[PDB]
Design a protein around this motif. Structure first.
Motif, PDB file in Angstrom:
ATOM      1  N   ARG D   7       0.822  -1.203   0.000  1.00  0.00           N
ATOM      2  CA  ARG D   7       0.000   0.000   0.000  1.00  0.00           C
ATOM      3  C   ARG D   7       0.856   1.253   0.000  1.00  0.00           C
ATOM      4  N   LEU D   8       1.933   1.258   0.781  1.00  0.00           N
ATOM      5  CA  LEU D   8       2.822   2.411   0.786  1.00  0.00           C
ATOM      6  C   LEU D   8       3.450   2.621  -0.582  1.00  0.00           C
ATOM      7  N   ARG D  11       0.919   4.096  -2.879  1.00  0.00           N
ATOM      8  CA  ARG D  11       0.731   5.502  -2.552  1.00  0.00           C
ATOM      9  C   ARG D  11       1.863   6.349  -3.110  1.00  0.00           C
ATOM     10  N   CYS D  15       1.462   9.370  -5.785  1.00  0.00           N
ATOM     11  CA  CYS D  15       1.968  10.711  -5.535  1.00  0.00           C
ATOM     12  C   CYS D  15       2.937  11.153  -6.618  1.00  0.00           C
ATOM     13  N   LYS D  40       7.675  17.403   2.183  1.00  0.00           N
ATOM     14  CA  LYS D  40       7.546  15.968   2.361  1.00  0.00           C
ATOM     15  C   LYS D  40       6.079  15.590   2.430  1.00  0.00           C
ATOM     16  N   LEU D  41       5.721  14.503   1.757  1.00  0.00           N
ATOM     17  CA  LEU D  41       4.319  14.128   1.716  1.00  0.00           C
ATOM     18  C   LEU D  41       3.845  13.496   3.014  1.00  0.00           C
ATOM     19  N   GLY D  42       4.760  13.127   3.904  1.00  0.00           N
ATOM     20  CA  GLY D  42       4.411  12.726   5.253  1.00  0.00           C
ATOM     21  C   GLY D  42       3.535  11.497   5.326  1.00  0.00           C
ATOM     22  N   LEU D  43       3.340  10.844   4.190  1.00  0.00           N
ATOM     23  CA  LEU D  43       2.417   9.730   4.086  1.00  0.00           C
ATOM     24  C   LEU D  43       3.043   8.637   3.241  1.00  0.00           C
TER      25      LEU D  43
END
Lengths: 72, 85, 106, 43, 247, 61
Positions: D7-8, D11, D15, D40-43
């Motif tokens: 999932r990461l 993502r 992005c 930074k997208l922080g996610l």
RNA sequence: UCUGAUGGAGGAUCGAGUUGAUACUGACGUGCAAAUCGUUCAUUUCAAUCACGUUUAGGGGCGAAAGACUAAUCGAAAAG
RNA sequence: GAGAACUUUGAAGACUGAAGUGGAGAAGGGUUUCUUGUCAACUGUGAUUGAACAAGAGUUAGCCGCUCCUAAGGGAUAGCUGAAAAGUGUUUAAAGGGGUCCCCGUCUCAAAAGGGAAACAGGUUGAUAUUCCUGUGCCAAUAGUAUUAUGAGUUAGAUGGUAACAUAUAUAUAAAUGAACUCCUUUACAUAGGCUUUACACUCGGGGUGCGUUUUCUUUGCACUUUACCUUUAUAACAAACCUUGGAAUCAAUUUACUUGGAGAAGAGGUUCGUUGAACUCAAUUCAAAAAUUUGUUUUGUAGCAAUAGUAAUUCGUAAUUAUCCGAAGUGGUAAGGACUAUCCUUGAAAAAAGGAGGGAACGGCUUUGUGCUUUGCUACUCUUAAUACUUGUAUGAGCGUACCAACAACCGCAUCAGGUCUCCAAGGUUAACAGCCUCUGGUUAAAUAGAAAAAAGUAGGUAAGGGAAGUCGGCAAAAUAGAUCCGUAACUUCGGGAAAAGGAUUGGCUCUGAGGACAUUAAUGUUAACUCAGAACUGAAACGGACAAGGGGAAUCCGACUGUUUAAUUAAAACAUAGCAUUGUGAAAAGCCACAACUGGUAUUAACACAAUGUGAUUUCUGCCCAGUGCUUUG
RNA sequence: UUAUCCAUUUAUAGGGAUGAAUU
């Protein structure tokens, strides 16, 4: 890889249906010595021949429908 | 030659801690590190393994005993009274 | 001199990640992770290593031949020979003393 | 890191996909843009 | 003020027992018909060190009677018991060091350990290393017997309660002076988080009734009543007396 | 480096003004003891085996 | 009792690293830096150091105790 | 290129100096990676560069990890509390599995450093590699029937050795009956110390090949001379343990150390495991001596893998040929193993999974009577591996991660910030040294700028005659030796120390001398290695731990005994802690101390040599009087 | 002793005279 020294065992392994190819390696020692290697599904069996006469006789007597590959 | 006049095994402690404290700890370390008679095999080869366990190097057999000696007077007295009967 | 690096995702020298340098036919020095050495099987009584039996880790012991996992006598591969002999005489002699006590009861 | 969850990773791919500029032919008729080092997208 | 260190102990967060390497609870056999009307002999297969306590434990193997098999028990070892020894448990067990008998069966003046203050609780009294109790008398009708505990107190226990004949091993552990703070550190590392102490008189008044002041003194009497609340019981709790003893 | 090693073999740069480690650090005294004991024990074993010495004298020495 | 070896104990010693931070009350103090730089200094078999995981949450925690620390916030955090 | 101090190439001078701006990873980042363009802004000077901008592309696994197990622990179920929210988690649980009536049994998550089925080498791309290619292996799985074939066993389960124990080598050591029920072992474990073995590392000499120096000297200096996993790898060797024989005081064997023996030592002969992984004639082969199959002598082979691959060379159209890849050793740096010794009021995880054993439930085949059993007639049959055919749903190998940075500009500090940030590899010289300094491989020559001038002043250093703390609150700062060897070392003392006390001498280079080992022959002769000490001449601008590195000492007083800890960012201390000492409470689930709204819980896997609450603070010598006051406590 | 409370266990025999041991 497995080395076998008994000539009867070598021929017996060669005649088996699993065996597909025989590898012939020849090289100068100091006289040319050779190595005959049957390729089976499990292992590759090599025998080292110091003389040429016996090596040629074994190669000729070898069952012919199995394919030969000469490395040099 | 003799290495220490009186400090004995407590020479490992150097000058730290009191002299009386070092002498008192010496008195019982002497018997904590000693070898005792294994009454099962008769060889003086019983050494302390842990705080209350004593193992014979020959018998390979271990026995519960005192903290710093194989036997304590209170225990030997009680055993004597019991065996009297 | 040639320096090496870990190859098996574990980059800490834990006891399962001991390595051996080895020089390849390509003339380069690489690292192979050594298998952890297994303890020897021990007798149930004296906790002494039993001979005649290999000392493989469980994964290798599963693949080992049956001859290499056992001995052939009584409690073989579980009790050492001297402990077995001592147990033999203990059993027989104690039954003998029980019988003689039974016959001496009257 | 090099090791990631599925999932990461998806993502991260999404992005990256959203960081492309507006198509030129559409411009015949963007502001939500990020740089990997600035924000930074922080996610 | 804030919650004092003694109060925080009951929360049991970091003050739980460091028990990772303990070998198990030390208990005698559960009461059984064999123990009630006979002897059952268990072989002490091993004696080991339990990191929490000073007394060594005994791994004792009993043979189950209700089914084929062997049961394992961890019993606080008595001084003088050895691996390979058979100990008998029950009413008819002979009186010898290491055996478990009802208190009513042993004569007066014998030393015991692993006492049951109530029958069947499989061992509750006299368990720290080197301690022992003395059987100081039996009732005429049986059914009751008086013992003297290591604290010096007489207690009356029913005659069917069991105990181990002998003294618990590792005696004398106190006489060695802990020479250095490191040994105390290692000692309490495997018990609790009760060390180092830090005197309350060195704290601030917010976190201890002894704290504060320009001279590090108690300031008020250090003997506190038994009824003092949790944050107040800090000094000598309900002290009957103070100062050096004379008898 | 080869030339310096040759000079050292001849004993050219071992003076006390050329030493920085202590005597033990330069030549471990425990190791010296080890070597001496091993050669003496080898000699005694050889003598006992060849029977040029008896068992009791071997033990005493 | 004395002597020589052997032996290798110790919250033993010096000392890099690590962990810190004695002094210059040096530099800097519109800094490289909302605590840094240089030299100096303390520490290195243990009450030692580190990582990850995990527990303890606000009139609470945690404290070898300085009203310390609890995300640049603490004699009562931060957000609304 | 429009434009070049900071883009690229070559040359030079230098740096980083295996504790590296070198290689691999983790956390964190997320495309920064690669290629091709490209310069509006950014890249604190320039910029044609770039981690910027734009377009495309790039991450390949049965063997590397996750996934599985369990730990500290988390969540949840049953209850029980609570208005609920929530709190606890077996406290009246009828709670899945096994064989075949019974036995066992809360669930689930938590480790990319713990446990753990199985992979190596060479090559390949612009970017991926134990993942792709080539070759060689390994692990796990493989349903039912039927055929074959391989082996055993049997007229219902094999055999050797006295023993320790060993034996199935079929393509492939696959099969050596075994139920219920049990009991073990492996997994599986601390620290310190030395001793030892092996591999890797480094180094020396010889042979070959290529290069370099070559005014002069130089049988010269440098580079290459390689060999993975797998084959129970076979063997060999060794520390140990065990067996047989043996029968020990004049005790002996033996280690560096101590270890061991009538509970059986030495000696002699064996067995096994473990280290390693071709050692040892190891294998095969030639030649001589044993008998109806053994021992000595040669050749071959890097033991197979294997040379076909790599490496360094010489040639040939521009893809091919050729030759080498072997004779010995030393140092002890790293890693692992072994056998030990020592330490603990400290004894240093578990489970998944796997194995061994005890026990002895069940028992041929073809046909038949009678109600699985008694029965009649015949015997060649049961296990195990492999292959094939058919049936079975389609009868091998799931899914996810894999680029790049890891700080020097890819992370966190508002940034391309001199800060912070975990792990592994670790060359040469000098040396005790992984120190310092210099160097080889690898990397770099870049830092928000350059050029010139060079005064004051600042800052970071140097040196200073004579004096030597007169300076100053204060020797702040600096200076002073400081390595090693030999000598010498006081008061005091808890006898351990003080102590490197204090305080002296020496140290280079060269040429020598002496001492310290191993290996064979018929008590005597040869071959050969390590640097380590000691001494003597000579020598020089009296200098030599030449740079680097590297204690200032002493006489006392105060405080704290000491090691340790502390106010992250003004106080490191005499403060805290500490061992020691003393006091207090408590005999237990109707206890002590503490938590909780209740239920319930921590100490407690505990039990007075314990737990809890305090004060003082090593040792030595002591610790006097007062219970009126205030506390605490005891009887009625 | 029936409410209630506590303890132990696999709720595993009604009262008096160091081998295993299960079908």
């Amino acid at each position: 890889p497995k080395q076998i020294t008994d000539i009867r065992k070598f021929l017996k392994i060669s005649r088996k249906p699993d065996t597909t190819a025989v590898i012939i390696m020849k090289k100068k020692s100091k006289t040319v010595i050779t190595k005959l290697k049957l390729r089976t599904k499990k292992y590759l069996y090599t025998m080292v021949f110091a003389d040429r006469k016996k090596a040629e006789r074994i190669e000729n007597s070898l069952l012919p429908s199995l394919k030969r590959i000469y490395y040099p | 030659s003799r290495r220490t006049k009186k400090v004995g095994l407590t020479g490992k402690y150097g000058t730290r801690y009191g002299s009386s404290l070092r002498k008192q700890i010496k008195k019982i370390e002497l018997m904590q590190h000693a070898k005792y008679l294994c009454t099962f095999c008769g060889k003086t080869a019983t050494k302390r393994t842990c705080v209350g366990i004593w193992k014979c190097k020959k018998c390979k057999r271990k026995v519960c005993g005192g903290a710093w000696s194989l036997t304590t007077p209170a225990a030997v007295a009680a055993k004597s009274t019991i065996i009297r009967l | 001199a040639q320096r090496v690096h870990y190859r098996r995702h574990n980059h800490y020298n834990t006891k399962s990640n001991k390595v051996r340098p080895v020089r390849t036919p390509g003339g380069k020095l690489t690292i192979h992770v050594v298998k952890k050495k297994a303890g020897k099987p021990k007798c149930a009584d004296c906790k002494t290593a039993i001979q005649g039996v290999k000392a493989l880790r469980p994964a290798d012991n599963y693949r080992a031949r049956r001859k290499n996992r056992t001995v052939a006598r009584a409690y073989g591969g579980s009790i050492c020979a001297r402990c077995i002999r001592e147990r033999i005489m203990r059993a027989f002699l104690f039954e003998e003393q029980k019988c003689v006590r039974q016959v001496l009861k009257e | 890191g090099s090791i990631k969850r599925f999932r990461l990773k998806q993502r991260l791919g999404k992005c990256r996909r959203q960081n492309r500029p507006v198509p030129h032919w559409y411009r015949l008729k963007n502001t939500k843009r990020r740089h990997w080092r600035r924000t930074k997208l922080g996610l | 003020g804030r919650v004092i260190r003694g109060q925080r102990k009951g929360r049991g967060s970091i003050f739980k027992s460091h028990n990772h390497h303990r070998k198990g609870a030390a208990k005698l056999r559960h009461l059984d018909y064999c123990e009630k009307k006979g002897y059952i002999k268990g072989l002490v297969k091993d004696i080991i060190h339990d990191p929490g306590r000073g007394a060594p434990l005994a791994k004792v193997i009993f043979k189950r009677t209700e089914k084929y098999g062997k049961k394992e028990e961890l019993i606080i070892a008595s001084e003088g018991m050895f691996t390979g020894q058979y100990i008998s448990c029950g009413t008819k067990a002979p009186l010898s060091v290491g055996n478990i008998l009802p208190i009513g069966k042993m004569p007066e003046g014998t030393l015991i350990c692993n006492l049951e203050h109530r029958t069947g609780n499989r061992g509750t009294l006299v368990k720290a290393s080197g301690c022992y109790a003395t059987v100081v008398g039996q009732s005429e009708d049986g059914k009751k017997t008086k013992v003297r505990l290591p604290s010096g107190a007489k207690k009356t226990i029913d005659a069917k309660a069991r105990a181990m004949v002998g003294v618990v091993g590792a005696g004398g552990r106190i006489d060695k002076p802990i020479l250095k703070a490191g040994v105390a550190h290692h000692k309490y590392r495997v018990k609790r988080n009760c060390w180092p102490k830090v005197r309350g008189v060195a704290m601030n008044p917010v976190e201890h009734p002894h704290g504060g002041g320009n001279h590090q003194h108690i300031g008020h009497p250090s003997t506190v009543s038994r009824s003092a609340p949790a944050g107040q019981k800090v000094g000598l709790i309900a002290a009957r007396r103070t100062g050096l003893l004379r008898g | 480096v080869r030339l310096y090693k040759l000079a050292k073999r001849k004993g050219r740069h071992m003076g006390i003004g050329k030493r920085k480690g202590t005597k033990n650090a330069r030549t471990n005294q425990k190791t010296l003891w080890i070597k001496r004991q091993r050669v003496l024990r080898r000699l005694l074993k050889r003598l006992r085996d060849s029977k040029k010495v008896d068992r009791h004298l071997y033990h005493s020495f």
